[PDB]
């Protein structure tokens, strides 16, 4: 697996740096796409695969499969994916957004914000990114920013989530839950809350999980978004925390500064201005390299690069825990 | 021997209020401000319950109570304290909205438990002296958690009511199952508030009340509904019938309310215009049912009816 | 022979409540939850009315009533249906806020009629048994439609109250005309809520109540006003005098109210703290006026006064 | 009558395409103009005339007359338009915006959102775009987006409107009404409501009529805006519907996708970000060509081009009715 | 000789309502709609006060009252007019929330005075006949202004409550000093609403009531607290002890309330569920204190207690 | 003192013109700066000094001292400034923004929006822009936009303020207060309220003082911001008023039009879009030159130039009183 990479520019001191090829996925890649801004990406085969949020010209929210040789240039299917489901009630499509994908043990799991009398977390698996078998929704509405851990945590599946409401939710804590079987969920634990505005305002309104947690010797590296409320709306930035390995609802370090915030025209102008919303990462433990995918202005998808050891140090050095 | 009063003569109402309401006064304890949830079950030679008693600090606490007749209560002055092996879950913040039922071999208690916002707490007891707390069933925000009094195809089942962090302006009843009273899933929507032009007493939000009452025709669900006036919410309650095997499937749902705020003790107090049903005792032999409900979030009331009359009213006036 | 009761001696109030209030109870009908609009007129050897009767489903429906004395009413159990040649307009969604007056050859009914939101429905009857529905007078959102009881310079005329899709937090009274009871126009603003520092009982929103009463010095308009407290709205009512020929021109408007919620039947009920005037009977010969009003959106009450006194009060306390 | 036209760019598949000379009217055309973003345009004499919303440097909303040879380059009068009115109360000017202009039988009629104890629909006529005779306001407040039909229907004048409130209204259905005399109005009928967000979210908060309805054998072509509410405010897009010829409150087809939505910098940045608000169109039945004027970010005016038969085919094929 | 009624036998309550409540009715004056702030002090061989009397126009005015026994009040019909040499500050817009205390050589009156929004008006009087207006103490928005009854280290001192332009959803008590009753500063935060899970009767906002009472253990502050239900605000009141020398430092603060809306005259009226303390008379030799408070923003009521008992209560139940 | 100046562009008829080198202070000037958008600038020594609002990458609001030879190119201290205070209660730092600086008789005074149980006006002095001595907060919360007068008025210090609330306040009048000693404040007077929307909508939601009042023979020249509320948020523009010399709460003239409104990409895009927030001015009575510093989009700092006599004449001739 060769992950995408660009070397940190000369004299850049930032922990993460934007791809000079951003945006890597344009808003109009498909004949009917309005925007493409969640890219739930993983290695697959001799390349990469992913589940993409592609909102169409009707402003419907759909998920599409994509493939790529280099993880930068994507061939996304024109037709939305369809989930196969034994149960007619759960298998009913209303809408879907916020996908996340990860491989656990023997297959790829997809979670997404699935409408079922409100936003909840849908769950499906695939062996091949062609047929997807839909499982029970993991939780009762309202919930989103569902993000699985990439292995079992002491014998059970684990998921981060984000209790919400039925609108543009003005609050949001990260939570942790477990399941023995991808059907029945429990042992719910609070992970963290928005910071106080006077401490770290980029994350003081609400927060939610981003990429699949990345295992490091110093804890699970969580890349997560945070919201700040100005008089003219919300600004979405993102940052990092380290979670205990065995009890990942225990936050050990949490960054004060953001890692990335809306700065470039493609992040500050578009369907929802001033949004950097991380959705996936690819990483390489040998080199420490990480590549983070993020939606820009809810319009296009970008990539940013960093080193895991540098991120860990930044997280601990600036920690507000 | 559950409490009973015959319908007044000439009264054609399906439910009739006890002539002795309120049956529990606001100031029964030395520091109680209000007492308005009564989660009542038969126990040993008499009755037991878990009661929401808000104190003079306006803190929300649960207290155990006992009664020989189910009308006159001796409520413990100390609040109930749960035992928990897990210190994280075992931390008390607040508690309201209790419900109590016997399932297979023990009594279970659910309540709206504070855990970074309202969720549904779960505990068991054999004796109403020691309570053993289990995992909270769901992530916040959730309340009106009401267990079924037996397993449904080999699993525990619970009605709930996803909510928000404040005075929630919405709310559907949901249904979930668990094999072990720890892990929960198979979530199914039961019902939504009605359109205001169909049935406005239940058009803002709804929530389950007493434990479901099994009948040959399905589960008898007594639930509250809210109407939003310019000067606030009005809580009334009514009746539905749920499928026996798949209780998320609603068979019949009443258009009219069974009861709504009328009397001064319902219409004046800490939260005016509230009738909030929280428990029921019934006898299948005679069809008699006795429904406990909170009045004005201040005091506790009792109402009477017959199960076959309620069922016929529910079908005849059904908006499904 | 309009209803009347003498001024309690050593009462100096412009209006005084009937000692028999409430004159219509909430449960007069077997399925009524509340009865609090009574759009009353003389008819044959007695009186007839269209009443807002909300049922135990909290649906809003209109029912006909009859009475020998205008105090004790026999209201039909079944809601009235309108007859309409146009299927789209004749679709019933909900109805409230009725008003009734005789114009020239027949009685006209207006009400708040649901047609993709609140608007003003219009109908005529000759007999109070069959009602023929005409075009809704305006586009939503509008209510408190009140016809003048004769034409104003060759046209039908109506007061209205532009509103929104909810519990509207604003409301001016407007005036409109129509040559044919179908097409409406020449809209003119009558008045806006007062500044709270001047007259706070009518500072949030106002609306017309009774059919305007012709006096030789202009139209007596009895209208409700709303005050917004931290705990919701308080509805009181008062008086204005409109120019005879151009009734959008307000000549005098009272600073103080005439009546405000005081009694328990006004202060406790489905919507607390509401006195909402809906009709009036009067006798020019004696100057007597009898004013019907909804109490707490639950029951109907009556109040009495003298036209000349009300006019004097209106001029003397005028904020215009 | 030679309407403005540019061909569809090479390989463009879109039903409408933007003028490459956008914006066609700049914000600062008049000495005190702040913004010029409604252009109610008609053929007149040997060229074109129009009534324009020009908000000045005091942010007052005024209407101005303009003229043009080619309908792209405009000479707008510096002085605001004054209406003559026989009734001094109705003739009182508080503010005006949202103009629309059309010729009905023997004269041009102007409607606008006119302040009369709140927004309502004002009405006037002119024969020459010099003297304007003000008629009665058509409706009681609150209402705007008044748009006349360009001929009588069943022997009456007809007008689409849009019941509103006293603010930045968070709802809005399109209504239809008739008048025998341009004075008394009635026979009010509901045309359509915002769509469900799951179905077509660009038009799920509110909608309102745009250009004068365009007669086709297939019904009235209505171009209308719709609003989507994001966390960061409203996004105005526009689309198309076909109304029954004889009973125009009856919608026959209604597009799922939008025709145009904010995409270019001049639509995304300015006084009100993310607005494409259609206001007028010129069309030529012989060729099928249509040119649609629309306000961009409440700052400038743009043009877009299409073919009426293609628009109708799109409206039908993608219909949500 | 302060008013006094002994505690009923068998009552463990720290305060008890007078059995003759309400002591001032809503209709005492010819045009009074409600009378519910009574800023009372000893004066001559009896008592005086400034009273908030809202009229039938719902305008908020202040009127002077006198009483020989402090229970039965003769309140003047004419609103009080302040004399002021500056016409800008002297302009009357509205006035409510009065408080009155003697400091050194005269009586001082504070009130919520409209000056482009609510702020704290200040005046003095020697005789309760002429009132001389001083500068408003603060910029809007502020109210619940309450002076200390002597200087604190050579300065006048005042508690206040920063607010907004509406029915304020927040509110901390602050402390400020002035050398000269014109320029104010050294602002210090006294306290904030409590967390709802700790003491919900005081979790939305709080504000000072009676003039602070000097005790050997600190200043006894009686203050109101607000709880926010789905149906509005509930106003209760409680006690704190402030440091004698630096009175922004709170030493003790009651978890429970001392009094909360319970009787019909507190629960029903213009603003339901309000007990708003506004003044207190006390006798240090016997420990007796008589607390005046508004009831449902309609009438005025009286409650009694013993200062040593209130202190012990405040200490024993302190949440700090 | 040689104040920065650029000559009025040929053809330009505006009363103020933007520097051709805007933004003069970039958002990333400091190693940890997210945005730099208030520049409270004064002559000092052989050049200029200032207190600057620099929000960091944690989105904390801090004040930093800066120095410049020319008042355009600034050397801002990396470390936030710290206030010295004898009282521990008042000396507690929670947050600070909205700085203003002016020399009064013998020292420089700094005001800012200081957190003390909500937003209030902090006050400090400095002789050297190295040590700052904090005084009592001038008012009880909630208040901001505190701006001292640059000399005493009838023997007293004087300050403009702006009573607010605990959020993004949807209202705002300018008030005036006095103090004999920079400790006790009083004699509060209403200066002005927002204008009616039908008169001057750029200033109809709220208003607040900007630069230190500039004394002229015709009154105090107040440059102030005004807010307009669109469906998509607030737009901040600024204009001018003349206050009576002896009783500065008496407004004598107040402009109808604005002087400046968000127009350029650096005013329209950034952390808070569509904001032009004036915070300071340098002026020369001999030449009438004035240079006005202003925050752009709450991101960067810009400069604009004008002539005081032109501004006085514009203010009077366009007066809405
Ligand atoms: K945690
Ligand atoms: K169901
Ligand atoms: K008028
Ligand atoms: K239709
Ligand atoms: K303190
Ligand atoms: K002034």
CA distances from A44 to A1, A6, B68 (A): 9, 21, 68
| Residue E288 assigned ligand-binding role | no
Q: How far is E229 from chain C (nearest CA, A)?
A: 10
Q: Kind and range of the H or E element at C109? A: strand C106-114
Distances F137 to B257, C11, F141, F237 between C-alpha atoms, Å: 58, 57, 9, 28
| F275, F261 contact by CB (below 8 A) | no
Domains within chain D, CATH numbers bracketed: 1-321 (2.115.10.20)
Closest CA to D236 of D213, D268, D192: D268
To which residue do tokens 């606001």 refer?
A: B26
Method: X-ray
Structure tokens at D266: 């001049």
Give the residue from E155, E183, E250 with the most F CB atoms within 10 Å of its CB, the best one to mutate.
E183
CA B165 to CA C262: how far, in whole Å? 36
Could you give the angle at the alpha carbon of D111 between the alpha carbons of D106 and D113, nearest 5°? 175
Among residues E54, E3, E10, E50, the alpha carbon closest in space to that of E28 is found at: E54
At E282 the three-state DSSP class reads strand
The residue written with tokens 């589940």 in the block is A51
Contact (CB, 8 A) for A133 and A180: no
Phi, psi of B294 (to 5 degrees): -80, 135
CA angle C277, C280, C285 (to 5 degrees): 150
Q: Give me ligand 2 centre to Cα B222, in Å.
A: 16
User: Cβ contacts (< 8 Å) between D26 and chain F: which residues?
Assistant: none
Q: Which tokens belong to C164? A: 């929104």
Q: Are D252 and D243 in contact (CB under 8 A)?
A: yes
D119-126/D184-192 β-pairing: unpaired
The answer, yes or no, to whether the previous bond of E199 is cis (omega within 30 of 0) is: no
Residues 6+ apart with CB under 8 A from A28: none
d(CA C70, CA C48): 8
Rounded Cα distance between B307 and B288, Å, is 6
Please name the residue that has the structure tokens 């929507």. Answer: B189
Q: Residues B295, B265: contact at Cβ < 8 Å? A: yes
| Residue B63, strand partner residues | B51
- Whether C201 sits inside 8 A of E272 (CB atoms) is no
Look-up: residue for tokens 């005037």? Answer: C277
What is the phi/psi pair of residue E265, to 5°? -70, -15
Q: Which residue from B299, B300, B279 is spatially nearest to B291, judged by alpha carbons?
A: B279
Q: Measure the CA–CA gap between A245 and A253, rounded to whole angstroms.
A: 13
DSSP 8-state symbol, B62: E
Tell me which DSSP letter residue C83 carries: B
Ligand nearest to the CA of F116: 5
Strands annotated E in D149-209: 157-163, 174-179, 184-192, 206-209
Q: How many CB atoms are located within 10 Å of the residue E295 CB? A: 29
The alpha carbon of D116 and the centre of ligand 2 are apart by a number of angstroms equal to 49
- DSSP code of residue E171: -
Q: Is A243:A219 a contact under the CB 8 Å cutoff? A: yes
Pairing relation of β-strands F83-84 and F132-134? parallel
C295 close to C26: Cβ distance less than 8 angstroms: no
Which SS3 state, helix, strand or coil, does residue E115 take?
coil
Q: Do chains A and E touch (3 or more CB pairs under 8 A)?
A: no
Virtual torsion, Cα A282, A284, A285, A290, nearest 10 deg: -50
Resolution (A): 1.8
**For residue A321, how many other CB atoms are within 10 A of its CB?**
15
| F61-68 vs F75-76, strand pairing mode | antiparallel
Task: Count how many residues are written for chain B.
Answer: 320
Note whether E199 contacts B57, CB cutoff 8 Å: yes
Length of chain E: 320
- C-alpha span between B5 and C162 (Å, rounded): 51
Instruction: Give the Cα-Cα-Cα angle A18, A21, A24 (nearest 5 degrees).
Output: 95
Residues of A in contact with F272 (CB under 8 A): 230-232
Contact residues, chain B, for E14 at CB < 8 Å: none
Closest F-chain CA to D233: F232
Nearest CA in chain B to A183: B185
Nearest to F230 among D31, D60, D271 (CB): D271
Closest CA to A122 of A133, A130, A131, A172: A133
DSSP for A140-203, written as a single string: PSSEEEEEE-SS-BTTBEEEEEEE--SSS-S---EEEEEESSSSEEEEEEEEE-PPPTTT-GGG
Cα–Cα distance for residue pair C190/C255, rounded to 1 Å: 16
| Interface residues of chain E, partner chain B, Cβ below 8 Å | 12, 196-201, 203, 227-232, 234, 236, 255-257, 260-261, 264, 267-268, 272-273, 317
Burial of C6 by CB count in 10 Å (0-12 exposed, 13-18 middle, 19+ buried)?
exposed
Residue A302 neighbours by CB under 8 Å, 6+ apart: A18, A19, A22, A23, A24, A266, A267, A276, A293, A294, A295, A296
Chain B closest CA to A76's CA: distance in Å?
Answer: 32
Cβ atoms of residues E71 and E23 within 8 Å: yes
**DSSP H or E segment with residue A315:** helix A308-317
CB atoms within 10 A of CB C119: 24
**CA A48 → CA A40, A53, A70, E232, distances in Å?**
11, 16, 7, 57
Closest CA to E52 of E292, E317, E311, E303: E292
Q: Which two tokens stand for residue F218?
A: 């015709």
Contact check, Cβ <8 Å, F56/A257: yes
């Amino acid at each position: 697996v060769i992950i995408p990479w660009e070397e940190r520019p000369a004299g850049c001191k930032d922990v993460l740096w934007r791809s000079v090829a951003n945006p890597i996925i344009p808003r109009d890649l498909l004949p009917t796409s309005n925007s493409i801004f969640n890219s739930a990406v993983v290695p697959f085969g001799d390349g990469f695969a992913g589940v993409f949020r592609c909102d169409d010209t009707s402003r419907r929210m759909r998920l599409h499969v994509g493939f790529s040789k280099d993880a930068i240039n994507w061939n996304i299917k024109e037709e939305p994916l369809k989930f196969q489901c034994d149960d007619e009630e759960i298998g009913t499509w209303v809408y879907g957004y916020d996908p996340r994908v990860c491989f656990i043990e023997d297959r790829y799991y997809v979670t997404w914000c699935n409408g079922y009398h409100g936003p909840t977390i849908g769950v499906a698996y695939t062996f091949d990114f062609e047929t997807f078998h839909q499982l029970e929704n993991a939780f009762i509405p309202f919930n989103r920013n569902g993000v699985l851990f990439p292995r079992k945590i002491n014998g059970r599946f684990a998921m981060l989530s984000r209790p919400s409401d039925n609108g543009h939710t003005p609050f949001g804590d990260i939570f942790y839950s477990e399941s023995p079987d991808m059907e029945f969920w429990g042992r719910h634990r609070h992970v963290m809350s928005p910071a106080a505005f006077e401490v770290s305002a980029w994350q003081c309104t609400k927060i939610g999980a981003g990429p699949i947690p990345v295992e490091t010797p110093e804890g699970w590296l969580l890349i997560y978004h945070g919201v700040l409320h100005s008089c003219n709306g919300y600004v979405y930035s993102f940052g990092s925390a380290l979670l205990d390995l065995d009890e990942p609802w225990k936050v050990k370090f949490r960054s004060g500064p953001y890692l990335l915030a809306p700065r470039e025209p493609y992040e500050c102008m578009g369907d929802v201005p001033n949004v950097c919303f991380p959705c996936a990462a690819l990483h390489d433990n040998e080199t420490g390299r990480i590549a983070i995918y993020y939606g820009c202005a809810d319009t296009v998808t970008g990539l940013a690069f960093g080193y895991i050891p540098e991120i860990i140090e930044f997280t601990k050095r600036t920690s507000i825990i």
